[PDB]
Amino acid sequence: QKFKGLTVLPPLLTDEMIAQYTSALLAGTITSGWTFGAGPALQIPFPMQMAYRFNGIGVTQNVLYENQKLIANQFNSAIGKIQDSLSSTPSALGKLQDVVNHNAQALNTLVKQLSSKFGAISSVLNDIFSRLDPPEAEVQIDRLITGRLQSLQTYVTQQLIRAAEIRASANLAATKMSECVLGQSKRVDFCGKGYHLMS
């Protein structure tokens, strides 16, 4: 591909930096609840924060204060089973796999299109110039140039449309980060299926 004028540029934020961002978000959540998203972070114990969240969903504090051990065990079992489910089912990361595959196949199509004739006598500019003289060599050259320009335009238009779709998805992801992680949402089926607690 690089031999044909197509390059891939690396992202500005690396995986290490993204992991540092994620770890900072997790630590802030664990040690402060939602206070770090509205102002200076304030310390609070985790069972008390969970009592806050049951109070939010509409259950009194005593329920957690008397079923603490059972709730902790249930949470541990669920978080343990998540990894097993993800490892087992080999179709979970379908969206990201399709994101990779779309770009791969678009680039492959753009590369392979270079061998078309577009009605000319050959797909080799050097052969065209070596075998014909300008008055009708220019016709074939124009045909090839127009075809390749059309290919580039189609590629760019499809890229623009896909970029718009990805931007919409990214805006939704940012909204979920703001509302499900830095707080506790009251919308139905926005965070999860049921009465949302954390994320």
């Binding site: 690089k2 031999f3 044909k4 390059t7 540029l9 690396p10 992202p11 500005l12 934020l13 690396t14 930096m17 540092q20 961002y21 802030g28 664990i30 040690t31 402060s32 102002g39 200076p40 972070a41 304030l42 310390q43 609070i44 114990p45 008390m48 590369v111 392979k112 270079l114 061998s115």
Partner: protein
């Protein structure tokens, strides 16, 4: 020289794009390669010319020890040969950066370069420095299972948010744009179908949609409430946001500041044709 083993008396070799890649010499039966001569992107990192005239050059996907043979040096002008190996060379994943000095400190990102590397114009003797962007100030709240923190004072803050609503409504005339004053061209163009109808429909749809957007944003209520004659709201005043009769269009001072800040380059809407023809020396873009 090529190390690809070949079935005998087999001459050509192609790639993914179906182009010649390996060839066999007719005189000596030896296999060669036709890999293209070295190439790559060139990017120029500069501050504004209002400040200085010093630049830095990035060579994408090239190791720093191969630049002189990659850019075809020792023949370019001596000014270009300065940005060759020379001195002050740093290597990133994006490629080789020449003309900037690496710094062990870390600040906010000013000019993005590659994977975690930015650049800026620093006073140090003004110079160009490249560093690793800083994620932010390190912090660590103290967690405890019998301790809490509670604020004792508050703060009222006011921020600002800006959102576009509508764009400019335009219209195009096929005959005037393509043929101009000729009529034979119009006669020829009459055989190309309904492209003009399609373009007119698309532009009309966009034009109507802009007005729909403005109505949706602003025409929420339908009763025009009037401000009370006297302004006392328990100590708050809103004079900065309410209308000022002396100022144009009965606008607020903040609205006037915004309208003066935004340089609307399209005056327009003055049905200008007589003055359009009169002042040729202006070379107005709208008239053009």
């Amino acid at each position: 020289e090529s190390n690809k083993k070949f079935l005998p008396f087999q001459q050509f070799g192609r790639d993914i794009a179906d182009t010649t890649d390996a060839v066999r010499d007719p005189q000596t039966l030896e296999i060669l390669d036709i890999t293209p001569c070295s190439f790559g992107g060139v990017s120029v990192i500069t501050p504004g010319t209002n400040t200085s005239n010093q630049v830095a050059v990035l060579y994408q996907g090239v190791n720093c020890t191969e630049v002189p043979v990659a850019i075809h040096a020792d023949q370019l002008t001596p000014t270009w040969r300065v940005y060759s190996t020379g001195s002050n060379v740093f290597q990133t994943r994006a490629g080789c950066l020449i003309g900037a000095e690496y710094v062990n400190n870390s600040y906010e990102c000013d000019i993005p370069i590659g994977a975690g590397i930015c650049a800026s114009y620093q006073t140090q003797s003004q110079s160009i420095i490249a560093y690793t962007m800083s994620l932010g100030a390190e912090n660590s709240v103290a967690y405890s299972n019998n301790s809490i923190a509670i604020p004792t004072n508050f703060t009222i803050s006011v921020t600002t948010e800006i959102l576009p609503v509508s764009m400019t409504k335009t219209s195009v005339d096929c005959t005037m744009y393509i043929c101009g004053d000729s009529t034979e061209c119009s006669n020829l163009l009459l055989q190309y179908g309904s492209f003009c109808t399609q373009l007119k429909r698309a532009l009309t749809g966009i034009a109507v949609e802009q007005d729909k957007n403005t109505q949706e944003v602003f025409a929420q209520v339908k009763q025009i409430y009037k401000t009370p004659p006297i302004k006392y709201f328990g100590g708050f005043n809103f004079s900065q946001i309410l209308s000022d009769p002396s100022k144009p269009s009965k606008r607020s001072p903040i609205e006037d500041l915004l309208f003066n800040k935004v340089t609307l380059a399209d005056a327009g809407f003055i049905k200008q044709y007589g003055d359009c023809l009169g002042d040729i020396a202006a070379r107005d873009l709208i008239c053009a």
